[PDB]
Design a protein around this ligand. Structure first.
Ligand SMILES: Nc1ncn(C[C@H]2CCCO2)c2ncnc1-2
Length: 167
């Protein structure tokens, strides 16, 4: 048993809810919250800016030190950093950004990072401002992630569309 509440079950291991990933993290304090990161860990908007704002910019300070030491992530890659006040850990995952021209095939590689963690609270990668089709992102998630993933979809008519259209 875990603390996640109000989720619709899509598959054996994937669950979905209409919720802000920030509000959910503050309530649950999950072991792992996933950030929709970029390779520079510049947390300006979408999930990264909201998560970072909720940490009072401590996520950005930590991220800047990570990049200064290690250099940028790969598209499709990830790193584990602190979850600050939101979670034990934050898994920063870089999905491809369609609005920058990145290969959508890298979305599967991005979701494979989730399999290193038994349970995660996550957004849909590459959806929203990243330019990918969220219906596609949910299909890749279900077909790639084998660990238990709780998807928070912030946008209301998108949640309803994802559920209604789910195969
Ligand atoms: N605070 C937040 N900002 C942005 N997104 C992404 C967009 C695209 C899907 C619906 O929301 C979030 N997902 C969960 N929480 C989110």
């Amino acid at each position: 048993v875990n603390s996640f509440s109000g989720y619709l079950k899509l598959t054996d291991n994937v669950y979905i809810k209409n919720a802000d990933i920030v509000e959910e993290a503050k309530k649950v304090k999950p072991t792992v919250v996933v950030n929709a990161a970029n390779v520079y860990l510049k947390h300006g908007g979408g999930v990264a800016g909201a998560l970072n704002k909720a940490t009072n910019n401590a996520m950005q300070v930590e991220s800047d030190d990570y990049i200064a030491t290690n250099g940028p992530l790969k598209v499709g890659g990830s790193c584990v950093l602190s979850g600050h006040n939101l979670a034990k850990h934050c898994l920063h995952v870089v999905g491809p950004n369609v609005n920058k021209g990145e290969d959508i095939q890298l979305l599967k590689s991005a979701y494979e990072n989730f399999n290193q963690h038994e349970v995660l609270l996550a957004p849909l990668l590459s959806a929203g401002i990243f330019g990918a089709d969220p219906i596609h992102s949910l299909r890749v998630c279900v077909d790639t992630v084998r660990t238990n993933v709780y998807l928070a979809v912030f946008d209301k008519n998108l949640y309803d569309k994802l559920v209604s259209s789910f195969l």
